[PDB]
Ligand SMILES: Nc1nc2c(ncn2[C@@H]2O[C@H](COP(=O)(O)OP(=O)(O)NP(=O)(O)O)[C@@H](O)[C@H]2O)c(=O)[nH]1
């Protein structure tokens with residue numbers, strides 16, 4: 001017959017915004033994630049039903065790595081609520097195509113739908129990748145425009161660039177695992193990269209055991225081979241279902257995966273203004289399917305003409321370099337280039353909880369990055385009759401004497417000099433610099449410091 005294409009479709013939104021009901025209406029043609037399937041044209045669509053509740057947002061994050069498309073639901077009448085945004089954020093950081101779906105249109109008037117419709121359009125424009133994503137009102141109960149919703153899901157998939165990675169090693173996470181006996185265990189999960197054929201030897205991590213694929217169940221059917229993008233049921237032998245829990249990852253023996261403690265990421269910030277750069281900060285880092293508490297130290301990479309140095313952020317977010325050395329409390333399974341998600345989940349469900357996202361560049365501890373502090377103190381040149389004295393670099397005599405012999409330039413005048421001695425008990429300074437110095441000139445003291 002015809003060749004089908006394997007598609008994962010997310011469904012996100014606030015609690016009671018009509019996710020599940022939309023799910024059921026699609027399937028026929030929430031603590032954990034829901035899993036279902038339906039066909040549209042030659043698209044085999046495996047539905048990922050995300051939990052609305054905000055204590056379950058761990059599931060929501062972990063529902064993103066799988067999907068190539070999503071539906072964000074929002075009640076017509078009461079419009080977007082708090083979770084609607086974090087789901088929106090999450091998908092936007094991970095560059096997942098969305099279709100905003102306005103549910104419960106039968107419970108609202110034309111006016112109230114148009115309002116909420118526009119409110120969404122306003123919001124979508126405040127997001128990087130989701131800038132303009134279609135919007136349809138539907139009623140799952142009434143069937144209103146459900147027909148269109150499907151025709152859109154088709155169009156969207158026809159446009160979106162879906163890259164199945166067959167080439168790299170087999171890499172697949174494990175959602176649920178349930179036993180049969182001591183010599184067998186069945187694990188489910190959608191395949192990230194690579195290929196598996198029945199009777200292959202793979203391995204569970206982080207526990208690092210070696211098992212063999214007895215069965216591939218895909219789409220309620222037993223097949224010899226599975227590919228990346230397929231959500232498969234998998235029976236393997238050489239492990240008990242007890243050892244395998246939420247964070248386990250099934251992959252081949254050529255894997256690039258590593259169990260990691262220290263992470264260095266290239267961080268982009270979600271909302272600037274909610275963002276703060278006070279280093280050595282306590283957050284909850286999302287890697288893979290886990291959430292590990294962490295400490296982050298933001299920094300930038302500035303070439304000084306010879307050697308590139310890692311400089312603790314000067315608080316300027318101008319230019320896109322907010323690298324972040326993470327140090328995790330627990331361990332985590334990661335690879336280079338894996339998208340990382342910085343969250344603060346300590347907060348109430350009522351406030352946006354995403355402290356940003358980024359690509360993992362290196363696995364490296366803060367200590368070996370050679371972190372350094374850009375150090376600037378600013379004084380003024382005060383000149384009386386026959387004497388030049390710099391003021392403001394030092395508050396007292398000791399502070400001043402410690403400064404003697406440092407580097408000093410004058411702002412805007414392209415001139416250099418050196419600070420020789422201390423003048424006064426109030427911490428003034430003397431210097432020998434190039435001539436043509438003037439009163440009320442600006443003196444910029446510059447040096448590199450050991451940070452923390
Ligand atoms: N009139 C109407 N009611 C709807 C529609 N979709 C959902 N509802 C109602 O909304 C309520 C919650 O629906 P549900 O799909 O379970 O929401 P959910 O997002 O799955 N809940 P959760 O976030 O807990 O998983 C139910 O009372 C359901 O009947 C719809 O299209 N029309």
Ligand SMILES: [Mg+2]
Pocket residue numbers: 019020021030051052
């Ligand atoms: Mg539900």
